[PDB]
Design a protein around this ligand. Structure first.
Ligand SMILES: Nc1ncnc2c1ncn2[C@@H]1O[C@H](COP(=O)(O)OP(=O)(O)OP(=O)(O)OP(=O)(O)OP(=O)(O)OC[C@H]2O[C@@H](n3cnc4c(N)ncnc43)[C@H](O)[C@@H]2O)[C@@H](O)[C@H]1O
Ligand SMILES: Nc1ncnc2c1ncn2[C@@H]1O[C@H](COP(=O)(O)OP(=O)(O)OP(=O)(O)OP(=O)(O)OP(=O)(O)OC[C@H]2O[C@@H](n3cnc4c(N)ncnc43)[C@H](O)[C@@H]2O)[C@@H](O)[C@H]1O
Ligand SMILES: Nc1ncnc2c1ncn2[C@@H]1O[C@H](COP(=O)(O)OP(=O)(O)OP(=O)(O)OP(=O)(O)OP(=O)(O)OC[C@H]2O[C@@H](n3cnc4c(N)ncnc43)[C@H](O)[C@@H]2O)[C@@H](O)[C@H]1O
Lengths: 191, 191, 191
């Protein structure tokens, strides 16, 4: 009871838009999912402690501070899952200056116990271009091969999640012009 | 003392053929291995319970129902390894509608405790062409890149197995026209 | 109690050279790190027992005779960390005739508990070319696609390490002619 779905992707791949369009379309049939953004759970604890003005400052903090707030947020979100189904928008790995940080390290992974881990992907081309069109959230404008490296290490981390807990790992394409098709696939997956 | 070899590969890549041709050539030098097909252990429990007419319907079931039969099948096979050496024909990950499912999740992995995990690969081209040549076992006719996606994730899970158990992870190419050469590589490995 | 940074890389890629140039330049800033070569600690226990004349003869021994000595060496290196910061030069995976053998299987990984895992990369072209220039440490002259297979699996193993411990996984390019740039990035990471 109470399903826990994790939705992941490098910044710019659009996992948030996918989650939101799928949830509003799930509610047309009375399938209620609550969206939880893990970075927002984290960003409220950080903003309480003075470590960050905004949320793009979090992947740059010392990784032991990152892991400390990540663990809190996983506990908090696990509690949210006791009340309703949740789709958790978060990361297979977070890119930090000191490397990729697993977003669900085994202790956090065990606390959420997701049923399905979704990887939202597209070509690094389209990601870089989406990142450059948004002068709101200031994201890594990195080379496309750096983007591909991230999507590469996201697959690796995510599949280890599946080896550890038995969750299925679903890859869904969210390509420029075809968001609707990513929603049909994610919707179909949650039934 | 009871060696346990796990042989993996996407459908059509030819692990059953590699195993059968190797085991009979091993028996010419007096090295007895028994072939054990994980999907058949599962398919005997499923059909006993009414879940399936055939075995290509098994990757489509409830993944909670899969993992429950998966664990059983690992148990039956762990007992088989007490009596003889086994090459187990199975899957690093199984493609299911709700994503890739680890074939040796950590509870099944520790019950089998394989010494060597073999990965049989070829180009996504040659696999698809093999799938279309066979109206006996009806298989996933997917894009060649979905086939490449699968072989990518099979490598991730297998290296995770190797991190968890210390098993070596061996990649063998089983290429068209060169089945012969793939057997020589595997026979050599089992010494 | 002090830092443990692990530096990994296929033979020929320059992890040993990178480590050393970084260690002496850190000492310009009064930052003392002790270099430790995982292969040398093993070969101190190994030639002590007669299994190898030289160190290229370790990826060639039976995979249970290695793992028998791999655990010993991780313990020695844990002891050094109580005394000084250590950068451990070792391998994400070791290529043996029986496959890739994880360099930090979970029991060794748990004893070292590295804070950061560095993967040193460049193109297999440049790596292969370096292996041919050296008639001193005689190395695997394998195809560039075999070198790529290896760098793939090193990444798979490395990210799984990061899932089990929370160590960040940093990818650093050590490109022909630009060793210095691979040194400033690692220096920058260690502050
Ligand atoms: N597990 C964890 N561990 C540790 N720390 C963690 C953590 N999880 C989070 N954190 C911390 O929190 C921070 C970030 O959290 P977070 O706030 O989740 O996100 P982010 O990394 O900035 O990702 P975005 O939501 O901005 O990417 P999205 O692509 O999902 O956005 P959108 O759907 O709008 O869309 C992107 C753009 O594309 C557009 N778009 C989407 N799809 C399409 C399409 N198909 N065609 C055309 N345009 C499209 C949209 O309109 C939009 O313009 C991290 O840096 C980390 O520090
Ligand atoms: N761990 C686990 N967890 C959960 N579920 C599990 C599981 N393990 C199994 N299952 C379940 O069991 C089901 C499938 O089990 P299983 O029957 O093991 O898998 P499969 O999907 O049917 O794979 P195949 O056996 O059909 O292909 P193959 O690798 O044997 O190729 P083969 O050599 O036979 O022949 C293929 C063709 O290619 C040809 N071929 C092979 N090599 C060459 C070559 N060099 N040149 C030309 N042709 C070649 C052959 O001649 C032949 O025509 C799954 O759906 C799943 O539900
Ligand atoms: N966890 C573990 N578990 C089990 N066993 C383990 C283990 N860890 C280790 N072992 C065992 O120990 C054995 C050997 O391990 P180890 O002793 O690490 O030796 P190796 O792996 O053979 O690596 P090398 O030291 O020969 O390569 P390097 O790239 O590090 O050399 P250099 O940096 O000089 O660089 C090479 C050449 O490239 C050049 N170069 C470097 N950078 C550049 C550049 N940017 N441009 C041009 N040239 C460059 C140099 O000048 C030089 O000529 C293994 O077989 C294994 O059994």
């Amino acid at each position: 009871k109470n399903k826990v779905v994790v939705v992941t992707g490098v910044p710019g791949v659009g996992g948030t838009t996918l989650t939101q369009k799928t949830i509003e379309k799930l509610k047309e049939e009375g399938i209620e999912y609550k969206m939880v953004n893990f970075g927002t759970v984290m960003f409220e604890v950080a903003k309480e402690e003075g470590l960050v003005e905004d949320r793009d400052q979090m992947r740059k903090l010392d990784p032991d501070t990152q892991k400390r707030i990540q663990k809190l947020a996983g506990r908090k979100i696990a509690e949210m899952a006791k009340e309703s189904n949740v789709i958790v928008d978060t990361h297979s790995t977070v890119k930090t200056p000191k490397g990729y940080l697993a977003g669900l390290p085994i202790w956090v992974l065990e606390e959420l116990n997701p049923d399905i881990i979704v990887i939202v992907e597209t070509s690094s081309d389209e990601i870089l271009m989406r990142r450059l069109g948004d002068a709101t959230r200031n994201r890594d404008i990195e080379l496309t091969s750096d983007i591909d490296e991230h999507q590469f290490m996201n697959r690796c981390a995510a599949m280890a999640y599946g080896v550890l807990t038995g969750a299925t790992v679903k890859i869904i394409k969210n390509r420029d012009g075809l968001l609707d098709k990513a929603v049909e696939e994610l919707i179909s997956v949650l039934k």
